[PDB]
Each structure stands twice: as structure tokens, then as C-alpha cells.
Design a protein around this ligand. Structure first.
Ligand SMILES: [Mg+2]
Ligand SMILES: [Mg+2]
Ligand SMILES: [Mg+2]
Ligand SMILES: [Mg+2]
Ligand SMILES: [Mg+2]
Ligand SMILES: [Mg+2]
Ligand SMILES: [Mg+2]
Ligand SMILES: [Mg+2]
Ligand SMILES: [Mg+2]
Ligand SMILES: [Mg+2]
Ligand SMILES: [Mg+2]
Ligand SMILES: [Mg+2]
Ligand SMILES: [Mg+2]
Ligand SMILES: [Mg+2]
Ligand SMILES: [Mg+2]
Ligand SMILES: [Mg+2]
Ligand SMILES: [Mg+2]
Ligand SMILES: [Mg+2]
Ligand SMILES: [Mg+2]
Ligand SMILES: [Mg+2]
Ligand SMILES: [Mg+2]
Ligand SMILES: [Mg+2]
Ligand SMILES: [Mg+2]
Ligand SMILES: [Mg+2]
Ligand SMILES: [Mg+2]
Ligand SMILES: [Mg+2]
Ligand SMILES: [Mg+2]
Ligand SMILES: [Mg+2]
Ligand SMILES: [Mg+2]
Ligand SMILES: [Mg+2]
Ligand SMILES: [Mg+2]
Ligand SMILES: [Mg+2]
Ligand SMILES: [Mg+2]
Ligand SMILES: [Mg+2]
Ligand SMILES: [Mg+2]
Ligand SMILES: [Mg+2]
Ligand SMILES: [Mg+2]
Ligand SMILES: [Mg+2]
Ligand SMILES: [Mg+2]
Ligand SMILES: [Mg+2]
Ligand SMILES: [Mg+2]
Ligand SMILES: [Mg+2]
Ligand SMILES: [Mg+2]
Ligand SMILES: [Mg+2]
Ligand SMILES: [Zn+2]
Lengths: 51, 109, 213, 112, 117, 169
RNA sequence: ACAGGUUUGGUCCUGGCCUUUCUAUUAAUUCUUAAUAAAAUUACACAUGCAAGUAUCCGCGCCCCGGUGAGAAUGCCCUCCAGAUCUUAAAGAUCAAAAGGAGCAGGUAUCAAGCACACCUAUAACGGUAGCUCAUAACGCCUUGCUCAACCACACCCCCACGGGAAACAGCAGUGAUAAAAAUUAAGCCAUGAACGAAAGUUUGACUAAGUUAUAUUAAUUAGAGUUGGUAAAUCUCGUGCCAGCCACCGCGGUCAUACGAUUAACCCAAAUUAAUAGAUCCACGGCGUAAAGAGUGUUUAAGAAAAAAAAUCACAAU
RNA sequence: CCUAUAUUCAAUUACACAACCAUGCAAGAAGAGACAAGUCGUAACAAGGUAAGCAUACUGGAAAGUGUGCUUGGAUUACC
């Protein structure tokens, strides 16, 4: 009874986690857009200087 | 120290008592080799009455004779006890008065 | 027990083997063993002195192999009784000899190991067994004609009550105890003596080692 | 049904110290012992020899030991049951996914 | 300690003080000393009559018969005591000594009436 | 005790008062936790506070910690059957972990009370002997009985010397 | 520890030593009677007596009890039980060898390496890998009974006991020797226990009851010991003159000594009182600029901490 | 070996061995401590009359002296 109960519990928590992680993935892609922008800018500045 | 170090060394343990002149025994029986006189240390002066004795353990030691006056010759057997005489450097033993060949001090007559 | 530095004692084993060997090799013939001085009533071998109550029966009676040595087949199928049984038990007490293995170191051939089937107080055992207290002098042989006179047995039933009262306190305990659980039966609690049957001390014990089941 | 070991150790978990011997893993099991003066818990370590049938054990793996009913030798009282954590390669028992340290190697939220 | 042989036995261990005896009824190995180690204490026996004129015996009957139920032999005074309780039949020697005592009383009665004359 | 961050937890009392008693199935508990992240927090606190309590009442159970192996905190219990309980502890508080574990494999207060009840019937009030095991030694010390003669010297008649000196003459 | 004395011309700090409490032996001085308890120098040598027999012969018993602490870091706690014994058909139950290990377990690291101390294969051998223990103390050396309803170990010596030295009280009494160390060459099996006996019962220096001894309690019949500079309760007059002597620590004695010796008085314990020796107790969860103490420097291993928020990087005389 | 049992044996051989320890005694050697109201100086303490000292080297009846780096647990009294 209790082992099955614990099983159920761990599965519930697993779902909660999966939700949280998808969220984090979204926020992370947003970060990636930001970083992409900055690195593009500085790549341009450097290309200019060297040219 | 830290907790780790205190665990590593264990709790402090009281060192066993180093044993003295009479070797853990309350008294010792011994025979008188010689009787002589010893000057005390510097702050205060007399000449104390001492003897040399050989003890049941075979160790020969200087020993002190309490009370005023005494009769002791070579070969006399005596009983000695632990009390250390403060004036006399190096003399850790004391003749028991009133046993074997050393009698109680005789009241003046 | 086990401490990592433990020493290998060899001489323990040596003393064991050597003592077992000197035991088997020097193992005494029962001829010299049960040999007896009849004047002092003293065994030479063991230095043992015999019980006072056993004195008369030593002088006036003969051991089994003293009466079995002058028998033709060395007494096979014969019937033998014991003086103490004759005196104490009026019902027939006898040994039917199956095998007899005498000891030949004996000059007079008075000693040996015996086997057989027993009838005590008329009751007969169904098996072969080694005979006990052979060296004793109680032993007597019954003649061929009086044989059927001794084996004649009047079968009588046993009158000892099968059940007895419980001791007073134990009884009261049982009563109160079944009273507690709602048992109203006032029927007297009874002690069943059926398996409490014990042989009298005269009954010979078996010398054969027990098989563990 | 009698199969037993007289050893208190029936189930343990320990690190793999060394693989040097044939079909045998040396394993350091570590327990919490209470230092009585300080009333505090420290790690006592003890080594066990475990039977590895397939020689499956790298050095550094976290491993479960089951007590052997009959001792293989004086020093081998245990058998290697499971490899709980393979060294440098670990599949998270919770989410069933490969991970290097606290990072996921394959995301549990990207099934396809 | 390990012995060669011997049996489980219920006996009297003598606890006590000079001229004031007391007995702990005890489940013991046979070969170990009297007052010494024991398997279990069963009961206690106070030989001296108290304020009310009583010798107190306490017996743990459950455990007593557990141990007799395990094949424990009783000592003669243990027997005498259990029989006095009525947990056991009266030991034959209790009764026999009772008779011997009665005959002693009879011969002392007659000797008294013979000396009075 | 002075040294340490939360010195109270090195006290005999604190260790005694933690209540979890594992079933007899439980042999090994493995804690796997992290030293960083907000989520793993409770787990850490657990390792810091209750792990000592737990281990104190379960002296024969092996407890082992592993740090920064898995990205997520959890417990594993190894039973005598070969059964493996996996307990995820994530955003769970310290207390929640304790109560949840006590729930899964605990011992009901019934169980524990029956056990201690069996241990308390071990010492029997009526026995006699050493002060260590017994309430009384002589029966000299029970009220109505005859006193220890080393307290109250006996009447001359109860003395064996008097009885022997009488039988002699 | 409820603390106290003592470093200095003096203060504060640090820091030893000692005092005050309790127990045991011995010794000195004193000692009236009971009861109880306990009885202890010695694993050196032992005169004499006794300590195991029972039982109609077989047998069953005969270091079991009792003795002792020599040895061994021996071991405690805990697994698992062959065997022996008892009872019974079996099953049970008591004692539990060997084998084991979660944990605990004397000192010493100026004992740091041990030197074969592992595993596999399989058939039980051939053979094959090259391991195993250890700074979380291996391997040594020294000291030692114990964690006590008890346990462990020894049984003249050579760990053992075939053999060999050699002729055995470490059973009760005793005796030499030895030591500061001093119980009766005693009475009973009446009671418990043990052995043997079917049983009446017999045996038992186990034990019961006695003998001895201020060793300790208690009760009353019993008064003596120590002390009186400070710590620390309590002193007067003589004698002595750095002499004779005294003291646990400080110290006292050089002609006006409450400190020596004696007297008077007092104090305090009391059938005991002091001394000596061992214990019990007592060090650091405290410290490390100047007092004992941050190891001349950096790196990694083992082992730990990560406990909440971030960082790596630019004039100048590194090498 | 028509019931059944009886009897025998189990000791050597190959080497190494007081090294190695511990415990006494010792011709002798060296040190420390205690020690004159002794002899010779004056090193240190005050810029101790050449500031002390550390490491190291060499030297000297004796404290000690001198070299080379280092320390302040020395001063330079501070609009000089
Ligand atoms: Mg002076
Ligand atoms: Mg003195
Ligand atoms: Mg005298
Ligand atoms: Mg006999
Ligand atoms: Mg007594
Ligand atoms: Mg002080
Ligand atoms: Mg000073
Ligand atoms: Mg001064
Ligand atoms: Mg005396
Ligand atoms: Mg004495
Ligand atoms: Mg003993
Ligand atoms: Mg040794
Ligand atoms: Mg068994
Ligand atoms: Mg065992
Ligand atoms: Mg010893
Ligand atoms: Mg020996
Ligand atoms: Mg001897
Ligand atoms: Mg021997
Ligand atoms: Mg003797
Ligand atoms: Mg003997
Ligand atoms: Mg003598
Ligand atoms: Mg005398
Ligand atoms: Mg008797
Ligand atoms: Mg009797
Ligand atoms: Mg006698
Ligand atoms: Mg006294
Ligand atoms: Mg004086
Ligand atoms: Mg004067
Ligand atoms: Mg004074
Ligand atoms: Mg005076
Ligand atoms: Mg300090
Ligand atoms: Mg310093
Ligand atoms: Mg530095
Ligand atoms: Mg240095
Ligand atoms: Mg100079
Ligand atoms: Mg100047
Ligand atoms: Mg100068
Ligand atoms: Mg100068
Ligand atoms: Mg000059
Ligand atoms: Mg200067
Ligand atoms: Mg220099
Ligand atoms: Mg020069
Ligand atoms: Mg020059
Ligand atoms: Mg200035
Ligand atoms: Zn009493």
C-alpha cells in the first residue's frame, strides 16, 4: 500500500518538475536571443577594427 | 582546536602517577650503612642528622632521622617512610621513629 | 576464538592421536578386568572394593559364563534367570540367549559378552539385545524339563486406576481457569496415568547406543 | 528455506577502491559512527571483498553488495549485486536520464 | 561457562546473613555454584516466621511449569515445597517423616507416663 | 558544547528526541543531494539536522551521503527483500521529508509502545538480588520480616552459637 | 569545586605546585564489651592431617564445586551454531566448542612500513593473474585480568605435554623462605548445593554454625590521639639562641620564638587518632601579536567545506 | 566368516641455531645539575661605556671577538 503510495507521489512530483523545466527552457531561449544580439554587435565592431 | 582534530586525538587522558622513592609501598625496611651530617640549602642553616640505608628493593638511598638526638650504628635495621625533607636537597626518605632499632625519642632526664 | 596472531598448537593433536591409539592397543581384556579377590573382596585391576550388600551373593553364586561354559553349544536357545529376580519377582523373569561371545584370554573361560531376548514379569520383549550385568554373581540356569514350568505364566490384568485427582491447588487453578472462559461443566478434572507407566529398578537397561531420529 | 550468512552486513553500499584481483572488486563501505565525547557523527571506513562475475567494475563506481550465503574465501563474504552509479556515466534514477554532475546530458522534457 | 554435561535444575540458592537465612528459588545449570549464575529466578522462600507467624513462599507457576515442561529436575526441598503448596502431590518423605515424628511423640508420651510412676 | 554552527544538535537530548524508527526491512539509506540551487535546500537541511537524529535511533542502519552526482535531490532505501524505495525530495521542506519518510517505513506508535511494554516486563518487581537488576536484595528489608542482623542483632535463642552451646550441655 | 595558599617593592595577566573532601592498606601511639561484614605480601618451596565417593558386583561420578590472577591487549557487545547433557517417539530445552563481525576496546609513531601477508580457475589437482595489510595506525614494543547476577584464563615448568625436566597445597588448615603486609594444623553434615542410590540414605575443609583480628559499619559499658604563625578551629609561661630542632605549601629558629623543646590553657576528632602510600577527583568545546603555541614558501593527494549574492585580466623593481 | 569377530602398525629424517634481545657488572670516557664569604676577568642589564640579537663561519683562558646578510625585542629627543 505504502510503496504504491510513494510511487504515485514520485510520479506527481515528476510531472511538477517537467512543467517547471519546460518553463526554464523557454526563459533560456529568451536569454539565447539576448546573447546572440550582443555577440553579433561586438563581432561587427571587431570586424570593423581589424578591417 | 576544531571538532575534527578533537575527534582525531580523542579526549585528554590523565597520565598515571610517576612513582617515588618507596616505589608505591607505604614503608620500606632497610639497614643502615653509615650515619653522617648534611647542611641544608642556603636560606636557612643547621646540620641535619642523616643516614645512608640499603632497602629491601636493593636500592641504596639517603634517609633522614627526625627528632632531637638518636642512636644509630651500622647494621641497625630500620623502617623508612615517604616524607620529603624540605631543607635537604635530594633526601626523599624518613626513618620511622619507634620501630626496630630506632626507638622513640627519650624525654629529657 | 580468532585473533590474527594466534599460535598453531601442534602437540594438542599429537597427544590426542597418541592417547586414542594407546587406549585401543592397551584396551584391557575383561578377563583380568572383572577378576576378583574373594578373600579381600577387591578387584586387582580397578583397586575397587565391592559393596557390603553384594558380599554373600559373590561367594555363594556364579556368573553367567560360569554356567554357560559347560553347556554344549555354549548355551544357545537356553533359558537363564537371575537370583535377585527369583527372590523379588514371583512372576517369571528370564533371558533367552541369542548369541554368546566368550573371552578366551580367561584360563577358566568365566567371562564374556552375551546377547538375547528378555521376558520380565512374564512380559516378553520382541527384539534381540545385549545382556546386562553378566559379570555379576546372581546368575542361574533353568533345566530343560523345568523349562516349560518356568515359561508357564498366569496372565493377570492391571488394577491401577487410569485416572487420579489433580493436586488440590493445581485442581483449583484448572477449575477457575475454565470458569473464566465460560465453561460451566462441573465435570471433575482428571489426571491420565496411561503414559506414566515406569519399569521397576530391577528391569535391565539396554547397553546398545541410541540411534538418533 | 535456509540460505543465510552469519555476517551483520547483509546489504551494504560502497565505493570501488580497486579492480586489481581477478573477478573480485575491493570496495570501501563507509558508515556514520557517533563519537561519544563530542556526540557527533564521523565516517568510519571499512573494506569488503565482493565477487564480480563479469568483471563489470571500474574504479570509483558506487556499488551495492549482497552477503554471500557461503563464503568464497576467508576475505570474500560478499557478492556484487548492482552497479548503483557507474563512474563518469550516470543515469538519474528519478528522471531516467543521462547526466554529467548537476547538469542533464539529455533533457527529460524533449522526448521526441 | 562451558561445562562437559549436567542438567537444567530448579533449586534453592542461599541468599542471606549469619543466623538469618533466605532462599531464592532458581532455574540453574546443575554444575555451576549454589548462589552463583542462574538461567532464571523462579521464586523466593523465607525460612524464618515473620511478625504474623508466616514463612513466605512466592512461586512463579507459569515459568515453573514452563521449565518442568522443558525437563528441569527439582531438588528435594523444592519438591517438598511444591507439594506443601499443593502444586505437586505430597512428597513420600514428607509423609514418612510425619509418621516417624508421630511414633516419636507416642514413645515419648509412654516414656513420660512410665517415668511419672 | 561551544564549537559548531548549531551546537544544540550535538546534545544527547536533541538526538534522543528525533523520532523516526525504521522497519526491520530497512538496511541501507542513501541520501543524494546538492550543495547548490534553491530547490535542493530542504534536502541539505535534512542532512544537517535530522540525519543525526535518524541514525541515532537506527544504529544498525547504514546511512550514506552523495553530493552533486544527480541534478536532483532524492533518497533511496534498500530493504532486506531486495526492494528499492526511491523517495524524491525536491522543493520539500526538512519537516515534510521527515514526516513523509516516517509515513512510508516507520513504526506505528502502537508498535513502539508494545515493544517497550515487552521490555518493561523484563524486570520483575518480586525478584531479589543486585541493586542493578532488582528493587531489593535481602528479604531483611521487607517490612514485616526478620531484619538483617547487621542492623538489629538477633535474640540469643535464634543464634546458632546458643543452640550449639545448649545441645553440647 | 562555592573555592583557598604561594611568583612581585607593588599591580594586573598567564601559569604550575599545594591545601580543604572521600576510600583502602600499612605503620606509630591508644584500646572496654558485643553484633555484622570482610579478611589481602608472594603462580617461591612445602613436614603432617583432611578436602570424592556412592552402589548387590556393572556403572555413574571424581579442577563440578573450591583456588588463583600467572599468562594474554588479551577482549566487551553481537551473529551463528557443531557437540555434550536432560527430558521425551519425535520435537523441545540447558551448557554452548569451532567459526565469524555493525560497533566499542591500555600505553607508545623515537614501532612506518609488513614481506607472501591475496585472488581466480575449477576440479579439488594441474594451472593462471600479482596481488594483500597499513598515517581512519598495519607490523612491532611495553604494561595488564575484566566492561562484574557474571566473564576470561591457568592447574609444577618446557604457550601445548606425546616426550623431557622432574616429583608439584594457585583445595582447608598449616610451615619455611620472602614482604611495610601474620585468621583455626578448629566442629558438624542439622540446613541449602552437589555426587551416587529404586529407596530409606551415605559422602562432601562446598557450605552451615563457631574460633581469630579495631579492617569497616552499628550499639552502648568504653578515653585517648592530633593540633593551636597563615591557608585553617584553637596558647600561656619558661628553656634554647641560624644551635637543637620544625614544616603539606608559604616559611620558623641570630636573646622578648603564640612556628623548636616542655608547661598552662584551648581546639578538634574519638575507640580511635595521626603519618606514609595508593586510589577516587582533577587538563583543552581552552588557547596560539608581546606569555606554551600560525609550523620559511607554494601545489596537489587523502580527507573535508561547499551552506544566500557575484568574480578570472592590464603604468612601475618577478623569473 | 554353522551366533561371529580377531589382529597389526603410525616413528623419523634434513638443517639452523645466542645471532638477537633483555637484565646485571665493567677497565674506562663524556655531559648536566648542585655547588665557597674561593680564583680570573667583566659578557649582559643605562646608546652597560664598541646598541643588543638571529643564522653561519673562523678565532680566543673565560665570559666572548670579528666577518656576511637579516631582525628591533635600540635610540636619533621629532615647525631640528
Ligand atoms: Mg633561616
Ligand atoms: Mg614531612
Ligand atoms: Mg613497637
Ligand atoms: Mg565403582
Ligand atoms: Mg554471610
Ligand atoms: Mg592559583
Ligand atoms: Mg614574575
Ligand atoms: Mg615577597
Ligand atoms: Mg596491623
Ligand atoms: Mg592484612
Ligand atoms: Mg574462578
Ligand atoms: Mg605480552
Ligand atoms: Mg546444537
Ligand atoms: Mg559459540
Ligand atoms: Mg599480568
Ligand atoms: Mg601453564
Ligand atoms: Mg606451587
Ligand atoms: Mg602447563
Ligand atoms: Mg593453603
Ligand atoms: Mg590440587
Ligand atoms: Mg613464615
Ligand atoms: Mg603475629
Ligand atoms: Mg548436607
Ligand atoms: Mg542430606
Ligand atoms: Mg569435616
Ligand atoms: Mg577504627
Ligand atoms: Mg611539631
Ligand atoms: Mg623565650
Ligand atoms: Mg602551624
Ligand atoms: Mg611548640
Ligand atoms: Mg591551560
Ligand atoms: Mg612565543
Ligand atoms: Mg609566517
Ligand atoms: Mg625555523
Ligand atoms: Mg658586547
Ligand atoms: Mg654613551
Ligand atoms: Mg659590560
Ligand atoms: Mg655593549
Ligand atoms: Mg670596554
Ligand atoms: Mg643595549
Ligand atoms: Mg652568533
Ligand atoms: Mg678576532
Ligand atoms: Mg681585525
Ligand atoms: Mg619622543
Ligand atoms: Zn540481610
Amino acid at each position: 500500500e505504502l510503496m504504491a503510495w510513494n510511487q504515485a507521489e514520485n510520479q506527481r512530483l515528476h510531472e511538477l518538475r517537467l512543467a517547471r523545466l519546460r518553463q526554464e527552457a523557454l526563459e533560456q531561449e529568451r536569454r539565447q536571443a539576448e546573447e546572440a544580439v550582443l555577440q553579433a554587435r561586438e563581432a561587427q565592431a571587431w570586424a570593423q577594427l581589424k578591417e | 582546536a576544531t571538532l575534527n582534530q578533537m575527534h582525531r586525538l580523542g579526549p585528554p587522558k590523565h597520565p598515571p602517577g610517576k612513582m617515588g622513592p618507596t616505589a608505591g609501598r607505604p614503608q620500606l625496611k632497610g639497614v643502615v650503612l653509615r650515619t653522617f651530617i648534611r647542611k641544608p640549602k642556603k636560606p636557612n642553616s643547621a646540620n641535619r642528622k642523616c643516614c645512608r640505608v640499603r632497602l629491601s628493593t636493593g636500592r641504596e638511598a639517603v634517609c633522614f632521622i627526625p627528632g632531637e638526638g638518636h642512636s644509630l650504628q651500622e647494621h641497625h635495621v630500620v623502617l623508612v617512610q615517604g616524607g620529603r625533607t624540605q631543607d635537604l636537597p635530594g633526601v626523599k626518605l624518613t626513618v620511622v621513629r619507634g620501630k626496630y632499632d630506632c626507638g622513640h625519642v627519650q624525654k629529657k632526664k | 576464538m580468532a585473533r590474527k596472531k594466534v599460535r598453531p598448537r601442534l602437540i594438542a593433536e599429537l597427544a590426542r592421536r597418541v592417547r586414542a591409539l594407546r587406549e585401543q592397543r592397551e584396551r584391557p581384556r575383561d578377563s583380568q578386568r572383572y577378576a576378583l579377590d574373594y578373600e579381600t573382596m577387591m578387584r586387582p585391576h580397578s583397586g575397587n572394593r565391592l559393596p557390603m550388600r553384594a558380599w554373600a551373593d559373590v561367594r555363594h553364586e556364579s556368573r553367567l559364563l560360569q554356567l554357560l561354559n559347560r553347556l554344549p553349544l555354549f548355551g544357545l536357545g537356553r533359558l537363564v534367570t537371575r537370583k535377585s529376580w527369583l527372590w523379588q519377582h514371583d512372576e517369571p523373569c528370564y533371558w533367552r540367549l541369542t548369541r554368546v561371545r566368550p573371552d578366551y584370554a580367561a584360563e577358566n573361560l568365566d567371562h564374556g559378552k552375551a546377547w538375547g531376548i528378555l521376558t520380565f514379569k512374564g512380559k516378553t520383549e520382541s527384539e534381540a539385545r545385549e545382556i546386562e550385568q553378566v559379570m555379576y554373581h546372581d546368575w542361574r540356569l533353568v533345566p530343560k524339563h523345568e523349562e516349560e514350568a518356568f515359561t508357564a505364566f498366569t496372565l493377570v490384568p492391571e488394577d491401577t486406576p487410569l485416572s487420579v485427582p489433580y493436586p488440590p491447588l493445581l485442581r483449583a487453578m484448572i477449575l477457575a481457569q475454565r470458569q473464566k472462559y465460560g465453561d460451566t461443566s462441573t465435570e471433575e478434572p482428571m489426571l491420565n496415568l496411561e503414559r506414566a507407566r515406569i519399569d521397576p529398578w530391577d528391569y535391565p537397561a539396554k547397553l546398545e547406543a541410541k540411534t538418533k531420529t | 528455506s535456509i540460505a543465510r550468512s552469519s555476517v551483520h552486513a547483509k546489504w551494504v553500499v560502497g565505493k570501488v577502491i580497486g579492480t586489481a584481483m581477478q573477478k573480485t572488486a575491493k570496495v570501501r563501505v563507509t558508515r556514520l559512527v557517533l563519537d561519544p565525547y563530542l556526540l557527533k557523527y564521523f565516517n568510519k571506513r571499512k573494506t569488503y571483498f565482493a565477487h564480480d562475475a563479469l568483471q563489470q567494475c571500474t574504479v570509483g563506481d558506487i556499488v551495492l553488495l549482497k552477503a554471500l550465503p557461503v563464503p568464497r574465501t576467508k576475505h570474500v563474504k560478499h557478492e556484487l549485486a548492482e552497479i548503483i552509479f557507474k563512474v563518469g556515466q550516470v543515469i538519474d534514477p528519478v528522471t531516467g536520464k543521462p547526466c554529467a554532475g548537476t547538469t542533464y546530458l539529455e533533457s527529460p522534457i524533449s522526448p521526441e | 561457562r562451558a561445562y562437559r554435561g549436567g542438567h537444567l535444575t530448579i533449586r534453592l540458592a542461599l541468599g542471606g546473613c549469619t543466623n538469618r537465612p533466605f532462599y531464592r528459588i532458581v532455574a540453574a545449570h546443575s554444575k555451576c555454584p549454589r548462589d552463583g549464575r542462574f538461567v532464571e529466578q523462579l521464586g523466593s522462600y523465607d525460612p524464618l516466621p515473620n511478625s504474623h507467624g508466616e514463612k513466605l513462599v512466592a512461586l512463579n507457576f507459569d515459568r515453573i511449569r514452563h521449565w518442568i515442561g522443558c525437563g528441569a529436575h527439582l531438588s528435594k526441598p523444592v519438591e517438598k515445597l511444591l507439594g506443601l503448596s499443593g502444586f505437586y502431590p505430597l512428597h513420600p518423605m514428607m509423609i514418612t517423616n510425619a509418621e516417624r515424628l508421630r511414633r516419636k511423640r507416642a514413645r515419648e508420651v509412654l516414656l513420660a507416663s512410665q517415668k511419672t510412676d | 558544547p561551544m564549537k559548531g554552527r548549531f551546537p544544540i544538535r550535538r546534545t544527547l537530548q536533541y538526538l534522543g528526541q528525533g523520532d523516526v524508527v525504521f522497519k526491520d526491512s530497512v538496511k541501507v539509506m542513501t541520501v543524494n543531494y546538492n550543495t547548490h540551487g534553491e530547490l535542493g535546500e530542504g534536502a541539505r537541511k535534512f542532512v544537517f539536522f535530522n540525519i543525526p537524529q535518524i541514525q541515532y535511533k537506527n544504529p544498525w542502519v547504514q546511512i550514506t551521503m552523495f553530493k552533486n552526482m544527480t541534478p536532483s535531490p532524492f533518497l533511496r532505501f534498500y530493504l532486506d527483500s531486495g526492494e528499492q524505495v526511491l523517495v524524491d525530495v525536491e522543493s520539500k521542506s526538512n519537516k515534510e521529508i521527515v514526516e513523509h519518510i516516517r509515513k512510508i517505513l516507520g513504526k506505528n506508535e502502537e508498535t513502539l509502545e508494545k515493544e517497550e511494554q515487552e521490555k518493561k516486563q523484563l524486570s520483575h518487581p518480586a525478584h531479589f538480588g543486585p541493586r542493578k537488576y532488582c528493587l531489593r536484595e535481602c528479604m531483611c528489608e521487607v517490612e514485616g520480616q526478620v531484619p538483617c542482623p547487621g542492623l538489629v542483632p538477633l535474640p540469643k535463642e535464634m543464634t546458632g552459637k546458643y543452640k550449639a552451646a545448649l545441645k553440647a550441655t
